[PDB]
Each structure stands twice: as C-alpha cells, then as structure tokens.
C-alpha cells in the first residue's frame, strides 16, 4: 500500500490488499464487495484515459492560441463553429458516435464478464490479438513498451488520470462563472492573484459586503 490520503489514523478496511494507486481513500465504503470494486476499477481507467486525451485539446491548443500562432476557437464554443462551415458534417455525429462505440464497448463489456473470451472464428483472422493479459490492460493494442517486469508504470497512468479529471471539472466550472477560457483565467491569477479568485469575482459564494 502506498501512503495514506490522511497522514493520520484513518484505518481502511479492504484497501490493504494490492491495487493500483491505493492510498486508502474510500470513506463511503463503495468498494466493500470485491465484484463491483473490480468494476469501478475499470471505470476509473476509462474516465482517466479518456479525460486526459480530452484535456490536451483544451490545453495544448489554447496555449498556442494565447501566444498567437493559431486562431482556433475555445472549447466552450468550438461546437457552434463547426456546423456553420460550408463543408460541414451536421448532426449524424451523435448517432454514429453511438453506433461505433456500441460495437467496441460491448466487446469490452463481455470481456469483464468472461475474460479472454473471444472465440476462434468469431472475427476474421485477428481473434488472437484481441485477447488481453488482464482486464483494462490488453496486449496487442500497445505496440512497444509493455515487456518490463515492474509493470507499475500504471501508477503514472492513474496519478496523471485522476489529475485530469479535476481539470475538466475546473474548466467547466471556470467557464461557467468567469466567462473566459482556462488559460485566460490563468494569465489573470498571475497578473492580479488576490483580486481574481473564486471568492470575490467568480461568483461561487454570495459575497456582497461593500464595507
């Protein structure tokens, strides 16, 4: 077990066992039954892995935007910029997004139920590559860099993934009361820290004391 989210005396009951990114953080005891703890673990990954690849489109691009290299729009209004384009792809995108994910995800849903269960003649000829080593960590998807014996580079995958999940929650909240992008919000806290915060300007609290 890795260090404790409280340094002091918060005894966990079922997290002493091995697992990735185990810091003993389960007050509500939602991981008591092991069968559904096994399910929530994969949820942290798909949310972790998806959130990180999403945060780059908000982050890697807006940094280049504030510097002035590109004139792309902000994420809070990128959706209304696509469909008015002459060469556009109007909303058959919601449904095709579901028809495409529905094929992959149920293949992932039936793996957690029956691990390594991809029949011999079910797919054309690549039935062997689709078998996975463990749940959440398949083999033939990564081309290099998964043959070490100390496999816990996974801890980087989680600490980076949990962090990004905070980012989008902050992007969405910052972009609902500040009215500006995430990086524009950063340039202000650096230029005038004490004035631009969640307390006084960002109306997250009813503070009206003009005296």
């Amino acid at each position: 077990d890795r260090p404790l989210w409280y340094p002091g005396a918060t005894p966990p009951a079922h997290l002493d066992g091995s697992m990735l990114g185990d810091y003993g953080f389960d007050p509500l005891r939602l991981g008591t039954n092991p069968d559904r703890m096994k399910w929530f673990r994969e949820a942290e990954l798909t949310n972790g892995r998806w959130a990180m690849a999403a945060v780059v489109g908000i982050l890697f691009t807006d940094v280049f935007t504030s510097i002035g290299l590109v004139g792309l729009p902000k994420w809070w209004e990128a959706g209304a910029q696509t469909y008015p384009i002459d060469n556009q792809t109007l909303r058959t995108l919601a449904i095709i997004e579901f028809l495409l994910f529905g094929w992959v995800e149920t293949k992932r849903l039936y793996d957690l139920r029956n691990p390594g269960s991809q029949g011999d003649g079910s797919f054309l000829g690549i039935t062997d590559g689709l078998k996975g080593t463990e749940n959440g960590y398949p083999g033939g998807i990564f081309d290099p860099l998964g043959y070490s014996k100390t496999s816990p580079e996974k801890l980087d995958e989680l600490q980076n993934g949990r962090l990004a999940m905070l980012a989008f929650l902050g992007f969405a909240s910052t972009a609902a009361v500040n009215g500006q992008g995430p990086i524009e919000s950063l340039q202000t806290h650096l230029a005038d820290p004490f004035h631009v915060t969640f307390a006084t300007n960002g109306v997250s609290i009813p503070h009206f004391t003009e005296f």
Binding site: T92, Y110, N114
Partner: protein
C-alpha cells in the same frame, strides 16, 4: 452445427443445442420450453418465405420501371384497372378479395393438418420436384442458406416500410441519396426517425 455467435464469449444456450441457423442468440429465453420452439421454428420459416417473395416484388416493380410497391393498390380508389407488366388484368376489387380468401384458406388449412413435425417445416415430394433435398449434405447446407437469406428479407421489408413513412421516396431513389451524399442523406436527417435530431 453452430454457424457462429452473435456475441462471441456469450454463454451457450442449451435449448438451441443443434438446429439449423443456431447462433446462440435467445437472450430473453423465448424458446425455453420444448413445445413452443417447434412452433417458433415453423413461424420463422414462414415469416421468412413470405418476406423473400414480397421483397423481390418491391425490387421487381422498381428495377423494371413499373412503379412503386406503395402505389400498387392505389388503382382501387382512382377506379382504373390493375396491371401486370402493363397487361391490364380485368378483375375487380371484390373479385380479388374473394378468390384470395378461399384459395389461401384451402392452402393454409391443408398445411396445418400435416401432424408430421419435420414436414411442417420442410415438406417433400411435390413442393421440391427437382430433388435437391435428396443429398443430406447439401440439404443441411441449403437449409442454412434458406434461413440466412430469409432473415435479410424480413428485416429489410420492414425497412421498405420505415423508409417510406419518414420519407415518401421510393426504394431505389432513397438509396441514391445515400450514395450521392451519405453523410447528409441519412435516417438521422429525416427529422422523424430520432426525436431532437
């Protein structure tokens, strides 16, 4: 004899252990009982065989340029006579409804009085004069072809109906919209198929 799996890795269903067209499908356990399965297996082949003929019909009218499958019975309200390859068949509406009922009632009734469970699905003799069923291998193989092709006709005859209601266009015209501009001309862009588009 399992042709495949609709869901690879799914749990086997013992009620469908050895039949033609088995894919281990049934997720609602319809067919758990042994007697009802013999009825469903009869209903599937007949819902099949009626769809395959009716499906080739709708294509035959449009491929040969005769008209729509939807506008075929519209002569009755207008009053003009029906046609088959523009031959002007003379019979009237009350004559069609009388001969159809008496003819099909004689046919369907004789079918139900068979009481031979294998022949209720796969008769012999007169219904197969050329004798393809004599070879057990090709017979077993051709049964999977009867059923695979039939399930296409059923799901797709429903498409001829659903396509028509949302868009009044005919079959081959509605296909041309996909090929001309797929991403724009789809069921999503009908405005009726999906609420909220």
């Amino acid at each position: 004899q399992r042709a495949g799996n609709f869901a690879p890795g799914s749990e086997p269903k013992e009620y469908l252990n050895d039949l033609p067209g088995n894919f281990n499908f049934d997720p609602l356990e319809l067919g758990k009982e042994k007697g009802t399965l013999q009825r469903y297996r009869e209903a599937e082949l007949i819902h099949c065989r009626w769809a395959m003929l009716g499906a080739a019909g709708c294509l035959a009218v449009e491929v040969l340029g005769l008209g729509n499958w939807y506008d075929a019975p519209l002569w009755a309200v207008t009053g003009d006579k029906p046609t088959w390859f523009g031959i002007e068949v003379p019979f009237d509406i009350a004559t069609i409804l009388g001969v159809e009922v008496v003819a099909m009632a004689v046919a369907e009734g004789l079918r139900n009085d068979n009481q031979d469970m294998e022949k209720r699905l796969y008769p012999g003799g007169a219904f197969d004069p050329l004798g393809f069923s004599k070879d057990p291998k090709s017979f077993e193989d051709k049964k999977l072809k009867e059923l695979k092709n039939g399930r296409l006709a059923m799901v797709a005859c429903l498409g001829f109906a659903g396509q028509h209601a949302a868009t009044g266009k005919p079959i081959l015209a509605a296909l041309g919209d996909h090929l001309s501009s797929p991403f724009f001309n789809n069921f999503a862009t009908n405005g009726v198929s999906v609420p909220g588009v």
